[PDB]
Amino acid sequence: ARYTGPATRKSRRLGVDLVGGDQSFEKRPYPPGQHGRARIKESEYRQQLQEKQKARFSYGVMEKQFRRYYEEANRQPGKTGDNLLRILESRLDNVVYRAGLARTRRMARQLVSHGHFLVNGVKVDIPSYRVSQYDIIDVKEKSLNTLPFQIARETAGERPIPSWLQVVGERQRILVHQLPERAQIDVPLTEQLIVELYSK
Amino acid sequence: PTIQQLVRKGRRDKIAKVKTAALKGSPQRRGVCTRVYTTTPKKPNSALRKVARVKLTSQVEVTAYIPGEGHNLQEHSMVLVRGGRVKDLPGVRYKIIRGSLDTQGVKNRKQARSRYGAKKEK
Amino acid sequence: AVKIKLTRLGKIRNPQYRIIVADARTRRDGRAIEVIGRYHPKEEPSLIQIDSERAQYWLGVGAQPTEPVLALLKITGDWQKFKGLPGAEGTLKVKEPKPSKLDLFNAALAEAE
Amino acid sequence: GPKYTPAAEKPRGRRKTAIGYVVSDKMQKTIVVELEDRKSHPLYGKIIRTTKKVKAHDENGEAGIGDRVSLMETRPLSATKRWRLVEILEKA
Amino acid sequence: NIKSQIKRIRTNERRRLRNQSVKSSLRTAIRGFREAVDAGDKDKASELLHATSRKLDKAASKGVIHPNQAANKKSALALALNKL
RNA sequence: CUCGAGUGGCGAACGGGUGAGUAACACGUGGGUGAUCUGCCCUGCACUUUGGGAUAAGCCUGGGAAACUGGGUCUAAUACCGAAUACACCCUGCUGGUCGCAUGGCCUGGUAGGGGAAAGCUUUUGCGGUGUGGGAUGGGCCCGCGGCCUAUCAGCUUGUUGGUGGGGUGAUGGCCUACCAAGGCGACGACGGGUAGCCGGCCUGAGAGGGUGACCGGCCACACUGGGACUGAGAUACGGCCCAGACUCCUA
RNA sequence: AUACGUAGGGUCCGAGCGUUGUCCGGAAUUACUGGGCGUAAAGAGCUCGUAGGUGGUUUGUCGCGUUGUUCGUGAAAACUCACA
Description:
Largest sheet of chain A: 2 strands, antiparallel
Number of strands of chain E: 0
Shape of chain A: globular
Structural class of chain E: mainly alpha
Keywords: Methionine aminopeptidase type1c, anti-association factor, inter-subunit face, ribosome
Strand content of chain E: under 5%
Oligomer: part of a larger assembly
Number of strands of chain A: 2
Largest sheet of chain E: none
Helix content of chain E: over 70%
Number of helices of chain E: 3
Order of helices and strands of chain A: HHHHHHHEEHHHH
Chain A: Small ribosomal subunit protein uS4
Entry title: Cryo-EM map of 30S ribosomal subunit in complex with MetAP1c of Mycobacterium smegmatis
PDB class: ribosome
Radius of gyration of chain E: 17 Å
Organism of A: Mycolicibacterium smegmatis MC2 155
Largest interface: A-C, 7 and 8 residues
Number of helices of chain A: 11
Strand order of the largest sheet of chain A: 1-2
């Protein structure tokens, strides 16, 4: 369903920006706890586990929903590494986040929790919703007039909208065009390790 | 190796190498425990481990271990025996679940908190 | 004897039906000799798609549609062919036209710019 | 219409017919015939070749030991005799 | 166990009880024809075959014996006459 | 009007259950039955003529603890029993033509002899009856082939095999039966012991392979146990029956 | 005692989370794919030969095995592809 913990501790443990601008994680880059300073018994096991945990904790996705992502990626005709990154870049909250309309992944998580978004005319309170190409996207007025959402929409100096997403008016219409391409995603650390580990 | 001789006979696996013998491959059975006398583990692992012999409902007489520190079971007890593997003891391949039919969970167990029948601390 | 039947399919709240031809002594979901149609009360137009000439044959040899199956036949006008009393005509309604997959985004782009 | 309405011919035949060798032409109106098979093994691939002792009816006693004959199956003509000796082409 | 069909019980008892006498009579007629044929008398055999071809055909038209059993018996008795 | 009880149809053998049994043409995959049946639906033609006996119900009387049960009288019919026309059909005798898979198949062959039915209610959308010709679908039988283990299971076999003639069956067929003959089955594993319903499938495995027959589907077997019989188009007849035991219940 | 037990403190999962029971693979640990038998498991003490398998060079036939082809065929769901 949904996780509980914040992102700073996981950022420190996995040693990567999970908030994106976590002041406290770069304050304490070592893993949390009395022995984040203490050196770890290094293993490629740890490398792959850290990679998958970064992937899970970056987007707000959670483990059981993540495993079926790999499985369906492997079922896809293309190489599993490509398909997994494509589909993880194909989530409803991900689609609305990359448009710069949500300041956090948890922003979009709680937004789809509340029901502040609309795809093709149908309201989907389900973050696990899949948004296809050429989908019509809109934002409801009750959230539109809300003050922090007004800040998010009007101060949208956040990360730029990728070429496969297009906010095309004041209605926050994200007229999606194509799939998230490998040459266009600009993804964090790759996922070939996940494919090789899960395939065994 | 003489393909025709294969047609004559051959190609069987070696041996099942069975593990569980309570009955029915039961995820657990229940029965009456007795002979709860403590015996000795292996010499390098010098200690003493509390065990018992349980006649399960499966009509077989097996040897079960009593995990944890404290025990609640005594003679004529409805103990639930599960399969186990104790290399520390000779011929002991069973345990009794704590926080279950008869044996109360191990007192104040907190590192496991699911095993040893230690319920949630309020 | 022989009867043309409606058999149930789909999940719980939304019913669907296949128009089959079968013996009475079977159950509702036995071996269909031939699937000759399909119908769904759940969908808007109760849309029906029927193999026509096989139904013509089976009516000829003496297939006896079930009461709602016969109702569906009339809803098609098929019973107006084997019996042919007024002649066969399109009697069933249809799903509304509805836009396409591409024209939706075409209109969205036109509205946007 | 006509009082009498006709029927069909139900194209019929092809009763199993095979070449065998008469081997036990011993009992009255009775022969025993054998057949050959050559079948690839399901697992290994060593084509095995086996036989079968069918019992055939000879109303005429034409056959004899070790004759290359042909047989078509009939209706069951007795308890284990279901073959008709036709198209005889070798004796001895 | 008793359920709303003892009427069927009585109906079947009646139906299987009439056929008892019917079959006894027909079998007695057939055995009589047998003594006629074995005795070597052809006129008595011909008349008994005629009467039985009437009787068993009636019984087959009635609900006592399947149509083809009657035809089988008719042919058998007819040949028994034809050769005596 | 309505409808209990009653006669009489029809339905009830399907629809649901279980996997005990079964190692078997049981199932699946492909074919034959020239050796075959089908109430119900569809479709041709022809007929439906006519006479008579009985009963439930209804009512009276009688025995039995009950279970239940007898006698007397009456009851109508699409109920039953006499009989008549059928030739569309069947059986026989002969015989013409024709295709052959040998028995044989086709011409409702012909011929001649013989034989075989039915119904009322109801005005009411009318429903209904008989016989045959055909459809349809449901079937019944036989066979190719596929799929447990175990000689610390190698001989088994006399209605077993073949023929004959019959009885019987829907049809073939030691199916059964009288005679004749002695065959027939196996190391390509009989006959035995144990084991098990089986398949579409499902799951693992890269694949092969391996394990399962949950549920959803396809068939089969079985419905206190064991023997027997019934009917109907159709019966291991689960909520049909009798008989021999078990168990249980009631018991005059 | 970072292995026990206790605390934080960390890992991960989450209305789940671990334990037991069973099957497949990993096992090539039945080796057809895909094993070996001097010393590690494995050549009977040695002969012949029934069954069986098994085959020299060359001529013609048959096309059973074998392959090529057309069609009937393998219910639906199965499972997958594609659409809703």
